[PDB]
Design an enzyme around this catalytic site. Structure first.
Site, PDB file in Angstrom:
ATOM      1  N   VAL A  89       0.839  -1.229   0.000  1.00 56.03           N
ATOM      2  CA  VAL A  89       0.000   0.000   0.000  1.00 56.03           C
ATOM      3  C   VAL A  89       0.866   1.269   0.000  1.00 56.03           C
ATOM      4  CG1 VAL A  89      -1.916   1.185   1.167  1.00 56.03           C
ATOM      5  CG2 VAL A  89      -1.774  -1.310   1.275  1.00 56.03           C
ATOM      6  N   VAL A  90       0.532   2.232  -0.865  1.00 59.16           N
ATOM      7  CA  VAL A  90       1.246   3.506  -0.937  1.00 59.16           C
ATOM      8  C   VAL A  90       0.318   4.620  -0.465  1.00 59.16           C
ATOM      9  CG1 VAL A  90       2.443   5.152  -2.378  1.00 59.16           C
ATOM     10  CG2 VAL A  90       2.743   2.696  -2.823  1.00 59.16           C
ATOM     11  N   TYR A 138       7.304  12.452  -3.301  1.00 61.43           N
ATOM     12  CA  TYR A 138       5.911  12.401  -3.722  1.00 61.43           C
ATOM     13  C   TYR A 138       5.793  12.987  -5.125  1.00 61.43           C
ATOM     14  CZ  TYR A 138       0.987  13.813  -4.041  1.00 61.43           C
ATOM     15  OH  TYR A 138      -0.309  14.018  -4.457  1.00 61.43           O
ATOM     16  N   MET A 139       4.986  12.349  -5.974  1.00 61.28           N
ATOM     17  CA  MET A 139       4.855  12.728  -7.386  1.00 61.28           C
ATOM     18  C   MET A 139       3.378  12.948  -7.699  1.00 61.28           C
ATOM     19  SD  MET A 139       8.102  12.614  -8.476  1.00 61.28           S
ATOM     20  CE  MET A 139       7.739  12.598 -10.243  1.00 61.28           C
ATOM     21  N   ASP A 166      13.912  -3.061 -14.487  1.00 65.64           N
ATOM     22  CA  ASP A 166      12.500  -3.127 -14.855  1.00 65.64           C
ATOM     23  C   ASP A 166      11.994  -1.783 -15.394  1.00 65.64           C
ATOM     24  OD1 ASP A 166      10.023  -4.131 -15.364  1.00 65.64           O
ATOM     25  OD2 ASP A 166       9.483  -4.526 -13.269  1.00 65.64           O
ATOM     26  N   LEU A 181      14.540  -2.465  -7.885  1.00 63.34           N
ATOM     27  CA  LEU A 181      13.662  -3.084  -6.898  1.00 63.34           C
ATOM     28  C   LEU A 181      13.417  -4.563  -7.193  1.00 63.34           C
ATOM     29  CD1 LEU A 181      11.878  -2.294  -4.345  1.00 63.34           C
ATOM     30  CD2 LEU A 181       9.993  -2.145  -5.908  1.00 63.34           C
TER      31      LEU A 181
HETATM   32  O1  LIG Z   1       4.866   2.910  -5.777  1.00 61.89           O
HETATM   33  C1  LIG Z   1       4.094   2.179  -6.388  1.00 61.89           C
HETATM   34  C2  LIG Z   1       4.492   0.772  -6.791  1.00 61.89           C
HETATM   35  N1  LIG Z   1       5.782   0.413  -6.256  1.00 61.89           N
HETATM   36  C3  LIG Z   1       5.990  -0.022  -4.981  1.00 61.89           C
HETATM   37  C4  LIG Z   1       7.259  -0.443  -4.596  1.00 61.89           C
HETATM   38  C5  LIG Z   1       7.482  -0.886  -3.306  1.00 61.89           C
HETATM   39  C6  LIG Z   1       6.457  -0.926  -2.393  1.00 61.89           C
HETATM   40  C7  LIG Z   1       5.205  -0.504  -2.786  1.00 61.89           C
HETATM   41 CL1  LIG Z   1       3.900  -0.541  -1.635  1.00 61.89          CL
HETATM   42  C8  LIG Z   1       4.945  -0.053  -4.066  1.00 61.89           C
HETATM   43  N2  LIG Z   1       2.869   2.556  -6.754  1.00 61.89           N
HETATM   44  C9  LIG Z   1       2.238   3.816  -6.373  1.00 61.89           C
HETATM   45  C10 LIG Z   1       0.724   3.735  -6.549  1.00 61.89           C
HETATM   46  C11 LIG Z   1       0.052   5.077  -6.256  1.00 61.89           C
HETATM   47  C12 LIG Z   1       0.679   6.176  -7.072  1.00 61.89           C
HETATM   48  N3  LIG Z   1       2.122   6.232  -6.813  1.00 61.89           N
HETATM   49  C13 LIG Z   1       2.735   7.355  -6.337  1.00 61.89           C
HETATM   50  N4  LIG Z   1       2.048   8.500  -6.410  1.00 61.89           N
HETATM   51  C14 LIG Z   1       2.617   9.639  -5.989  1.00 61.89           C
HETATM   52  N5  LIG Z   1       3.842   9.797  -5.494  1.00 61.89           N
HETATM   53  C15 LIG Z   1       4.548   8.661  -5.442  1.00 61.89           C
HETATM   54  N6  LIG Z   1       5.826   8.515  -4.983  1.00 61.89           N
HETATM   55  C16 LIG Z   1       6.162   7.185  -5.077  1.00 61.89           C
HETATM   56  C17 LIG Z   1       5.125   6.469  -5.596  1.00 61.89           C
HETATM   57  C18 LIG Z   1       4.072   7.396  -5.839  1.00 61.89           C
HETATM   58  C19 LIG Z   1       2.819   4.995  -7.169  1.00 61.89           C
END
Ligand SMILES: O=C(CNc1cccc(Cl)c1)N[C@@H]1CCCN(c2ncnc3[nH]ccc23)C1
EC number: 2.7.10.2
Length: 261
Positions: A19-20, A78-79, A123, A144
């Site tokens: 979860v992010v 954060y993006m 990747d 990763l």
């Molecule tokens: O980060 C990922 C997949 N990778 C991952 C790798 C290791 C552990 C976990 Cl839990 C996930 N997905 C998310 C989904 C929601 C939108 N995102 C963002 N939006 C805004 N800012 C951001 N910064 C970083 C990601 C991010 C990407």
């Protein structure tokens, strides 16, 4: 290297797959908090390399701020505009090709830096790039895959393996190198100029691999000029040693940017 979790304020969920979440660090600084699903990663290995991936600083790499070490947390830049793949597929943006080329250069700048550090992404794909509030593209989750435990993703014969982004020597022999990152980069340019269509759209992974083994390739997206198509096509030479570097690709992209306007 380690961030105190008590300094985090969680504010919104950004996605689940772990979860992010969107949050704040010490009240002020925007962060992404990646909460890793239990059992999904080789966490000890990840932690040791995390010490290395933070010295990896570049304006076009999604920055690693630290880890919290259950679940362990990965705290990153954060993006605001989310993953490049979904951004590309939002038709409302009505991109100019100049913006598309700039997206490509953003990623090429990041990858040249990683190349200069002898660091592989392993990747690279539009789904692994992010877009910030200014529309700048940065590459995330570099390296990763080395720590993901799911075997449908680990192996070239896996149901979740990036078949459509892999050169022949990866599909046949698992031979990874700078040039498999180069190959993936060319597919990424194709994704960008196709506004996020799936590479080899009408094929399965298994059909895609046979097609690549036969020597056939992706063809030119409508939005790509001949000079842009030449750049992406050059990443797909059957001989890995025939493929350019990211330094050379950067110069080619800069050259075309000048020639358009
Ligand atoms: O980060 C990922 C997949 N990778 C991952 C790798 C290791 C552990 C976990 Cl839990 C996930 N997905 C998310 C989904 C929601 C939108 N995102 C963002 N939006 C805004 N800012 C951001 N910064 C970083 C990601 C991010 C990407």
């Amino acid at each position: 290297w380690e961030i105190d979790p008590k300094d985090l304020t969680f504010l919104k969920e950004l996605g689940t797959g772990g979860v992010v979440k969107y949050g704040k660090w010490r009240g002020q600084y925007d962060v992404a908090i990646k909460m890793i699903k239990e059992g999904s990663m080789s966490e000890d290995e990840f932690i040791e390399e995390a010490k290395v991936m933070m010295n990896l600083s570049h304006e076009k790499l999604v920055q690693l701020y630290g880890v919290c070490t259950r679940p362990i947390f990965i705290i990153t830049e954060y993006m605001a505009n989310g993953c490049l793949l979904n951004y590309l597929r939002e038709m409302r943006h009505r991109f100019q090709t100049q913006q598309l080329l700039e997206m490509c250069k953003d990623v090429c700048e990041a990858m040249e830096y990683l190349e200069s550090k002898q660091f592989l992404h392993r990747d690279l794909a539009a789904r692994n790039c992010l877009v910030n509030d200014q529309g700048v593209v940065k590459v995330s989750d570099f390296g990763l895959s080395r720590y993901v435990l799911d075997d449908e993703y680990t192996s070239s014969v896996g149901s979740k393996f990036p078949v459509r982004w892999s050169p022949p020597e990866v599909l046949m022999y698992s031979k990874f190198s700078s040039k498999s990152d180069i190959w993936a980069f060319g597919v990424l340019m194709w994704e960008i100029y196709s506004l996020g269509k799936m590479p080899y759209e009408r094929f399965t992974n298994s059909e895609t691999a046979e097609h690549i083994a036969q020597g056939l390739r992706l063809y030119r997206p409508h939005l790509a000029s001949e000079k842009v198509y030449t750049i992406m096509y050059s990443c797909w030479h059957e001989k890995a040693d025939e493929r350019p570097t990211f330094k050379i690709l950067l110069s080619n992209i800069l050259d075309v940017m000048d020639e358009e306007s």
